[PDB]
Symmetry: D2
Subunit: 470 residues, 4 copies
C-alpha cells in the first residue's frame, strides 16, 4: 500500500526531513550572523523564494510560448511571456529592437548557449583574461596552457588583458590582438573588474576585425537595470547575464539579442535585419537544454518586476556608494586596490604588497564569519594574490556607507591578525595553520562580527520565525 | 531612499506580485483538476518544494565539499554530502564502488558533462535513435541529416534503432554497427522506450568494441531505486539521471560513476582502477557549470530520503501496474501500442493506423484537460506532427490512483481519440480545417466536464487544495 | 673556387655518382629479368621518361595557366594546358561538362585535395573498407579502431564492406549505412577489388542521402580510357586518379570535376550550375601544395597522348584478357580467388585455406624474381602478414605477354606457392624457422632460373636492354 | 593488335610527342636566354636529371628500407638508405642524434607531414607571417581573416611578425605572443626573409612556452650544408626542407628529426629519449602519402653527394657574395631593400617608395626576360599586386656569374624599374592604362635584346647547349 498523499506529499519539511530542515535553519543563521562580501552573492526576496519553491517545478514546457512540445502550458506560457516582457522593460529595451530568452538554467549555461548559437566548434573567441578580471566562461585556459573552461575546449580562446600599470583594460592591445587573431566573437564584461567598460571602443574593435560583440553583464546587471553604469545594449549584439547577483533574483540566466533592421554598414546589403533570435532559441533548446525550470522563470519574473522599481534604483545607487566608501577606507589604511578604486559593486584588493596570499586572508576571514573569496589578480598563474569584496549582499540588508566603513575596519582587523599569525608561525601553510587554533583574537573578532551582523534586517525569511536565534 | 527590507524583502508573493501569484494559483488548479499523463512529469512533495524555495538559493559554493573556491560553506557542504550519500543509498550502491556528482542543473547538463568528462570533441557515441525512443542528448540528428542536439555537433553520433516490426531494440544491428563505427561511448536508457533494457548484452557489445557504457535512467530512475526494473549499475561504467521524473524530486541531474578496482579484463593491467571521479567532477565544474544550485541539491536530498521509504517502493510497483492496466484497456479497444504493452511507467501509442497525428490528439486532449504529449514513433520525421502519443503513469499515481482509476483514464482517452476522429471525419485532415471543429464542440465540453469531475476525486501533493485561490 | 658548370653540371650520372648509377643499372636488370606482378606497377615509355628527366624540373609555376604567381611561364603554361586538354580527351569528356586539375603530386595528394575542396574538417565520408579492397585514402582505420590514414583523422570515416561470402560489394548494406550515417561524400573505386562497379547504384545511394559521389579510378584508369570497363564519369561528381598504374604514365595525380548546368533534381534551383572548379583548384594550390612538378606534368601529357592511341586500347583489352586467363589457371588448381575471378586487371588470392600468409608467399616469390605484394583479404587484421596476395597484369602485358604467357606465370606462381607450403611443412610456420628453409634451396634456384629465362624472351619499354650495364 | 614494345615504349620523345618535345626545347632556350632571379629556383645538374628521368619511376616501395609493403625492393632500399645517409652527412649530423625521412613529395608535403606527426587537429602553431617573409605552410591566413593554407584549416595558426620599422624579426613580440597563445609548435625559417635566424632565442622562447621548435630551411638549405649560415640543427627538434632551391637538387622534401637522449630538462625525467622517428615516418606513410617517388629519391641522393663537395661550398659562398653585391648596387641607386641588405641568397626590394606595385615590375621584367616574382612586403594584403619584388642569386650563380655580373644584373633591374616608372608617368597607374605601355615599346624591346645578349653567353647546367634545338 502506498503512503496517503497527505503523509508523503503534504507534510512539511520540518517533519519529513528534520536533518535537511535543521541544516537549512543553520545556514539561515549563518547568513544572518556574518559579513557576507562575496561580490557574486545577494539575499533575494521572500516573494522570489515563494515562486521558486512552487508547483511550477512540476511542468514540462519545452519550446517557446505558443509553440511547445507538450500539452498543458496555458499558464506556463503566460508566465514565460511576462518574464520576457519584464526583462526587456527592466533594461529599457524596445521590443522591436531586442528580444530575450529566459530559459538558461544559470549563467554558464547562458553563455555556452549564446556561443553555440553564433559559433561553430573551434571558432575563435576573445574575452577578458581570468587574472585580469574575466570569467571562466570567457575562454579561460591557464598561463601554463591548461584548458579549464569548456569555452576553451569547444572553441578557440585568446584572452585580452589589463594594462599592468593602471589595471584597466588596455584597449590598444585588445585591438592589436583582435586584428592578429581575428576572433569571430569578442566578449566584454567580467567577474572581478572594478571599472566600467568602454563599449563604444569594443564596438570599434569588433567592427575593425569583423567580430560579433557580446557583453556578459552578470555581475553588474542590477546596476545596468538601474542605469547606474554604462549600458552594453547601446553597442553589443548579444548581452548575457545571470539573475542572482546584483539583480537580486533567483539563480538563472538570460540571453538578450538584437532584432529588426541592422544599422548601416559598408558592404552589408540594404534593409538587412538581425538574425539572432532563432539561432539563440535553438541553441538553448533543443540544442543544449531540455525542459525549462519554470519555478526559476516565475521567480525571475518576480525579481524583474522588483528591479524596475524606484526602491531598486536607490538600492543600486547605494551598492555603488557602499563599495566606494569601503574602498576609500581600505586605501586610507594603505592597502592596494586594483585600479585604485571602483566604479561598480566590488573592489579587488591586491594582497601581495603585504606578503599575503588570498587563501590566508580568506581562510582567516571565514573563521571570523567574514565571507570573501580569494581572487586572482594580474600576474597570478593558479592561493592567488588578491581578495575580492562586494557590496550587494550587505547593502540588501540595509547597510549604508558608515556601516561599510565598519566592514572596512573589520577587514583591517582581519588582515592585521593574518599578518601577526604569519609573522609568528610562518608563511608556509603547515606552519600558518597552527596560528588558527585557539586564537583568542580570532574568537574576539568572530564575536564582534557576529554582534555587528545579527542586528541588521534580513530579506527572504522572517528572523522571528527561524529555529536558531542565538 | 531604499525600501525597508521588510517591504521589498519579506512581503509575501501575493502582495509583491499579484500577477505572478495569480498565474501560479491558476497553474495549481490546472494540475489537480485535469488528468496529467506526460510520462516525464510528476507531482513532487511539499517537503521537496519547501527546500527548493529556501535561503539555500543565496549561496555560491563552487568546488566540492571541503574543497571550495569560496568561504562560508560549513552547512552547504553537509547538505551536499548528505545528498550524495543518500543518492548512493537510494540506488543500493557501495561507496567503495560508486560515486556520484549531484551538481548538474538538469538532465541535459548531466549528460553533456558526463560526455565531456570521458570524450574529446568529435569522439564517437552511439545511443538509441530518437524515433526509436532515445533522448535528444543521446546524439540526435534527423533522418535528413540535420544535427539537432549539441551531442551530435560536439561529438560524432551514430544512433542504433529498434526492430521496425517488433519495436524492440535490435541488439544484433547494435553490435554490427558498433563493430563498424567503433564508438568511444555507448549510451542506453531512453525517453519513450516501453520495455526494459538488456544491460548484460550492452556490456558484451561495449567490451567487443572497447567502448565505455553509460545508462541514462532519467525516466525510470524511481523504478530503479525501488528495484522494480533492471539495475544498470550492474553493467554500466556511468549512470546519469534526472531527479524530477519517476524519482519524484526537484528538477536536477546526477552522474553516478564507478570507483575502485576494475573487474578482470583481457590484456588489462593488474591492479587497474577506475579513473572517472576526477574527470566527471572537473567536467561539471570548472569546465561546464558555475555555482551549484544549492536549493535544488537540498531539495534533492529530501527527495532521495523519500525515495528510500517503503511507501515509495509501493508507489513504483503501482506506477508499473497502472501503466500495464491502462495499456490493457487501450489494446482492448483495438489501439496500437509500440511493442504491444509495457514493462515500465509509460505506453507509446501509435496513432497512424487511425489516420491521426499526435498533434491532433494532443490538441483535443488539452482542450479536455487531458495533458499528454505528441511523440515520435518509428519512422517519424515530423516533430510538429509525429505519429504517436506517449502516456505515462507516475504523475497520476502520485495522486493515489490505482488500476481501476487508470482504466477510467483509458476510457477518457478512448473518448478523446473517438472525438478526434469524428472531428477529422467532418472537417478534414488539414490543420486549418480541423481547428474549426474545436469551436463550440459540445462533446469536447462534456468530456472536459467529466475529466474535471473525475480529477477532483483525488488528493494532491505539493500544496493544500483546501488553501488554493481557485477552488472547486 | 666554384667547379666549372661543365664539371658539376653537364657531366653524366655515370661519372658524377657511380654508386647511384650502378644501383639504377641493377634496378633496370631486375625489372626486365623477372616477372613483375604488382597490380599498381607498370613500365612506362622512354618518351615519358625523357620528359620526366628534363629542364622542366627547374621551373616554379604556382597558380594556373594564365594566372601564375611567378613570371617566365610562357611555355610551362602551354605544357599544362596541353596536359589538361589531353586528359579530357583521353577519357572522352566534353570541356563544357568536365574540367581537370593535373598538378597533384601523386594519388594520395589528389584525394586529400579533392576532399579538402568539398569537405570541412570532420565531415563524413564513406569508402570501401581496406580489407574489402579500398585504398588507404578512402578513410582507412582498422577493425581495432586505430586511425591509419589521415583521411580517417581529418574526416569522419565509415567504410562499407563486401559480402563476406561472395566478395562482391554489399550494395544493400551500403545504402542502409549511408542512410544512417549521412555522409557528405561517398567514395567508390579501389585498390584490390577484382570486379567492376555499379556506379548507377552508387548514384542512387548518393542521391538518397544527399551525398557527393567520387570515384577513385587510379588502378583501372587505363581501362577506363580504353572504354574497357564502366565509366565513372556518367554518374560521379568528381573522379580522381593516379597516372602510373594501368594508365602507364609518370607518377602523378589528376582530379576531374563536373562543370556547367546540374541535372534536374527535386528542390534544386532552376539553372543551378556546378561549383567544383574553383574549390578544387584552390585546394590543390594554395591550400595544400606548392610549386607544380612541371616535369611530371610534361611527362603526363606524353602518357595521355599515348593513352588515346589505337595501340593503347589493344593493350587494355589484353590486360583484361591476361588477368582472366591467369585467374582461370589458378582456380583450376584449386586456389581461392576473391569473387572467383576478375573483371579488371588483377586477381586477389586468399592463401588462408592453405594455412599460408601473404608475407611468406611474397618473400619466397621475391627470391625467385617473382614480384608480388602481400595483401589484405576480408577479415584480415595484420598488415605485416595478411592472408592474401594480389596479382596484376599491366606490367607484364606492357612487355607484350599474352594469355598463354600468363598461363606460364600461373604455373610459376603455383610452383612458388607449393614451395612455400613445402618449406613451412618442413621448417615450421614461425618466421624464424621458415626463413631457415630459404637458404640454399635447390627448388628456389630452379624456379628462379626458369623465371629469368622466361623473362628474357620479351622486350622491355623505357630503356634499351642492349645498352644496359648488367647484360644476360 | 598491340604496338610493338619498341614503337610505343623505346621510341624517343622527339618522335613520340613532337609537340611536348618542342615545348621543352623552347623552355630550355628560355632558361638560357633570360636572367632568372626567382629566389626559389635553381638549375640542377644533368646527373640529377638522369636519375630523375629513369626506370626508378616504375617501382612501388611503400614502407621503409627493409620493411616494405611490396616485393622487389632489393635495390630501391639501397638507394633510399644511401639518400638518407648522404642527407645526414651533407648537414654534418651524427646519425645517433639525427634521422631523416626522404620520402616527402615536395616542401609543402614535408611540412604538413611533420605537423601531422606531432600535432592533433586544431593544435596551435606559430610561424612567420607571410607578409613578414614566412611561407604559406607556416599557417597563412590573411589579415582579413581568410584561411588560405591548409595549415590554418587543420591547425590553429597565430603568425608572428617582423618589427614594423627595422624589418627584423621582433623577438620580444614573438615571446609575448607565444606565452599568450601557447602554441604546441613554433616554426622558424622563411621564404622572403633576408637575414639569418637567432635559433638560440627561438629555443629560449619554445622552452618558455612549452613548444616544439621546427625550422623550415627550404630556401637556405644549400647555405646550411655549406656551413655559410647559422645551423638550425643546433637548437631545433625538427628541420624540414625542400631539395630544389639553394640545395640545387630535384624537387622533393626531407624531414630531419632528433633521435637519442634528450638534453637535461627539469620536469623531464632522467634517461629520456626523443620519440620523433616513428611518428614522423608514420605521418609520411601511411598517414598522408602513398608510394615514394623513387626517381626523386635517387636524384636527391645524387644532389646530396654533390652538395657535400668543396665546389658546392664555394658555390654557397658565391651565392651570398652575389646577393650582397646586387643589394649594394641597388641601394647605391637609392632603392629600398628590406633590412637594408642581406645575409643569405636573396634581397627583398620594397617598391612602394617609388609608387610601384610588384605586379608592374614583375610584368615589365618578364617582357624583358628578367624573371622575378612580385612579393608581399610588410603590411601588404593584395596577392595580385603586392608592394615588393624578391630577387634571388642561386640560379644565375649556378651559371657561373660572379659579383661583377650581379652588378650588371643590378643595372638591368635599374633599367627595368626606370622604364616601369616612365610607363607609369606616361600611360598611367591603372592596369588598363599601364598595359598600353607594354605594347610596341621600343625601350622594352631594347632592354630585352640586351638581357638576352648578356644571358645567352653564360654556361648552362642540366643539358648540352650544343645539342639544343633552339640555339638562337
Ligand atoms: N523518443 C523521444 N521522445 C520525446 C523526447 C526525446 O528526447 N526522445 N523529448 C525530450 O524532450 C520530447 C520531444 N523533443 C523533441 C525536440 C525537438 C525535436 C526536433 O526534431 N526538432 C527539429 C524540428 C522542429 C520542427 O519541425 O518544427 C528542430 O528543432 O529544428 C524532436 C523532439 C518529448 N518526447
Ligand atoms: N585493399 C588495399 N590493398 C593494398 C593497399 C590499400 O590501400 N588497399 N595499399 C596501398 O598502398 C598497399 C597496402 N598498404 C597498407 C599500408 C598500411 C597498412 C596498415 O594497416 N599499417 C598499420 C599496421 C602496421 C603493422 O602492423 O606492422 C600501421 O602502419 O600502423 C595496411 C596496408 C598494397 N595493397
Ligand atoms: C532519458 C532522458 N534523459 C535526459 C532528459 C533531459 O532532462 P532535462 O529535460 O531536465 O534536461 C530527458 C528529458 N525527457 C523529457 C521527456 O521525455 O519528455 C530524458 O527523457
Ligand atoms: C561574469 C560572469 N558570468 C557568468 C557567471 C556564471 O554564473 P553561474 O555560476 O550561474 O553559472 C559568472 C559567475 N561568477 C561567479 C563569481 O564571480 O563568483 C560571472 O561572474
Ligand atoms: C620556406 C619554404 N618552405 C616550403 C616551401 C614549399 O616547397 P614546395 O613548393 O616544393 O611545396 C617553400 C616554397 N617557396 C616557394 C617560393 O618561395 O617561391 C618555401 O619557401
Ligand atoms: C585506388 C588508389 N587510389 C590512390 C592510390 C594512391 O596513389 P599514390 O601511391 O601515388 O599516392 C592508390 C595506390 N595504391 C597502390 C597499390 O594499390 O599498390 C590506389 O590504389
Amino acid at each position: 500500500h502506498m503512503d496517503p498523499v497527505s503523509v508523503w506529499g503534504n507534510t512539511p519539511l520540518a517533519t519529513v526531513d528534520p536533518e535537511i530542515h535543521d541544516l537549512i535553519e543553520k545556514e539561515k543563521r549563518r547568513q544572518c550572523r556574518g559579513i557576507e562580501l562575496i561580490a557574486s552573492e545577494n539575499f533575494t526576496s521572500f516573494a522570489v523564494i515563494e515562486a521558486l519553491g512552487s508547483a511550477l517545478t512540476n511542468k514540462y514546457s519545452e519550446g517557446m510560448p505558443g509553440n511547445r512540445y507538450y500539452g498543458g502550458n496555458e499558464y506556463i506560457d503566460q508566465i514565460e511571456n511576462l518574464c520576457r516582457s519584464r526583462a526587456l522593460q527592466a533594461f529599457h529595451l524596445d521590443a522591436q529592437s531586442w528580444g530575450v530568452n529566459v530559459q538558461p538554467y544559470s549563467g554558464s549555461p547562458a553563455n555556452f548557449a549564446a556561443y553555440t548559437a553564433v559559433l561553430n566548434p573551434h571558432d575563435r573567441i576573445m574575452g577578458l583574461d581570468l587574472p585580469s578580471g574575466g570569467h571562466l566562461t570567457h575562454g579561460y585556459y591557464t598561463s601554463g596552457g591548461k584548458k579549464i573552461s569548456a569555452t576553451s575546449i569547444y572553441f578557440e580562446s585568446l584572452p585580452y588583458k589589463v594594462n599592468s600599470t593602471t589595471g584597466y583594460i588596455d584597449y590598444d592591445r585588445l585591438e592589436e590582438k583582435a586584428l592578429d587573431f581575428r576572433p569571430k566573437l569578442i566578449i566584454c564584461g567580467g567577474s572581478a573588474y572594478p571599472r566600467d567598460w568602454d563599449y563604444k571602443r569594443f564596438r570599434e574593435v569588433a567592427d575593425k576585425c569583423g567580430a560579433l560583440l557580446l557583453c556578459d553583464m552578470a555581475h553588474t546587471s542590477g546596476l545596468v537595470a538601474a542605469q547606474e553604469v554604462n549600458s552594453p545594449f547601446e553597442y553589443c549584439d548579444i548581452v548575457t547575464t545571470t539573475t542572482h547577483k546584483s539583480l537580486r533574483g533567483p539563480r538563472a540566466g538570460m540571453i538578450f539579442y538584437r532584432k529588426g533592421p541592422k544599422p548601416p554598414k559598408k558592404g552589408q546589403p540594404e534593409n538587412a535585419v538581425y538574425d539572432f533570435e532563432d539561432k539563440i532559441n535553438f541553441a538553448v533548446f533543443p540544442s543544449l537544454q531540455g525542459g525549462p525550470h519554470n519555478h526559476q522563470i516565475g521567480a525571475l519574473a518576480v525579481a524583474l518586476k522588483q528591479a524596475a522599481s524606484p526602491g531598486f534604483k536607490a538600492y543600486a545607487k547605494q551598492v555603488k556608494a557602499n563599495a566606494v566608501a569601503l574602498g576609500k577606507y581600505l586605501m586610507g589604511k594603505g592597502y592596494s586596490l586594483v585600479t585604485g578604486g571602483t566604479e561598480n559593486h566590488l573592489v579587488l584588493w591586491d594582497l601581495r604588497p603585504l606578503g599575503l596570499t588570498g587563501y590566508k586572508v580568506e581562510k582567516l576571514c571565514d573563521l571570523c564569519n567574514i565571507t570573501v573569496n580569494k581572487n586572482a589578480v594580474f600576474g597570478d598563474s593558479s592561493a592567488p594574490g588578491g581578495v575580492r569584496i562586494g557590496a550587494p549582499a550587505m547593502t540588501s540588508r540595509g547597510l549604508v556607507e558608515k556601516d561599510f566603513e565598519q566592514i572596512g575596519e573589520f577587514l583591517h582587523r582581519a588582515v592585521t591578525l593574518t599578518l601577526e599569525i604569519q609573522k609568528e608561525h610562518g608563511k608556509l601553510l603547515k606552519d600558518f595553520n597552527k596560528g588558527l587554533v585557539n586564537n583568542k583574537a580570532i574568537e574576539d573578532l568572530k564575536a564582534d562580527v557576529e554582534k555587528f551582523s545579527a542586528l541588521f534586517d534580513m530579506p527572504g525569511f522572517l528572523v522571528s520565525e527561524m529555529k536558531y536565534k542565538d
